[PDB]
């Protein structure tokens, strides 16, 4: 599924991401835009052989099991395919674990490089939330 901006914002809010660990909703929308262009089916292979999955590009070395990443820790206890669903629950639940791991949203390089320190409120402007 390719979400609209406000549609994604509303779904993220319903799943409790607004101000989760102090990160306002716009941060999450911005991260999703630059990680996946709001496409739940996005996959991208990394140089280390791991793969990133879904709307928030969650990686198979640490977080989910894709059956081809040796030494995967699978800390979210899910198959990576679950992160490609039109229903964002699994992605959100795993993202909550990732953001709690010590480095906050710096875990997403696209967030650090393209969202951090910008006017992230713009990402939810206009939306009925």
**Residues that are catalytic:** 35, 52
Q: Is 104 in the site for Cl ion (CB under 5 A)?
A: yes
Q: Which of 120, 12, 77, 26 is nearest to 58 (CA)?
A: 77
Could you tell me the smallest distance in angstroms from the CB atom of residue 15 to Cl ion? Answer: 19
Q: Which of 24, 33, 18 is nearest to 113 (CA)?
A: 33
Counting residues that bind Cl ion (by CB under 5 A) gives 1
Could you tell me the smallest distance in angstroms from the CB atom of residue 41 to Cl ion? Answer: 29
Q: Which of 21, 18, 14, 43 is nearest to 29 (CA)?
A: 18
**Among Cl ion, Co ion, none, what binds residue 66 when CB lies within 5 to 8 Å by partner kind?**
none
3-state secondary structure of 20: strand
CA angle 124-101-40, nearest 5°?
45
Contact code string over 46-75 relative to Co ion, x by CB under 5 A:
------x----x------------------
Q: Is 24 in the site for Cl ion (CB under 5 A)?
A: no
Interface residue list for Co ion (CB under 5 A): 52, 57
User: Which spans of this chain sit near Cl ion (rule: CB under 5 A)?
Assistant: 104
């Amino acid at each position: 599924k390719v979400f609209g901006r406000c549609e994604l914002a509303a779904a993220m809010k319903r799943h409790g991401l607004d101000n989760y660990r102090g990160y306002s909703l716009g941060n999450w929308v911005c991260a999703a835009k630059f990680e996946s262009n709001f496409n739940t089916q996005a996959t991208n292979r990394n140089t280390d052989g791991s793969t990133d999955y879904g709307i928030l590009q969650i990686n198979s070395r640490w977080w989910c099991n894709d059956g081809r990443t040796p030494g995967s820790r699978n800390l979210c206890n899910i198959p990576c395919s679950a992160l490609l669903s039109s229903d964002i629950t699994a992605s959100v639940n795993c993202a909550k674990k990732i953001v709690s791991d010590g480095n906050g949203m710096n875990a997403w390089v696209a967030w650090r490089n393209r969202c951090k320190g910008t006017d992230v409120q713009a990402w939810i402007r206009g939306c009925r939330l």
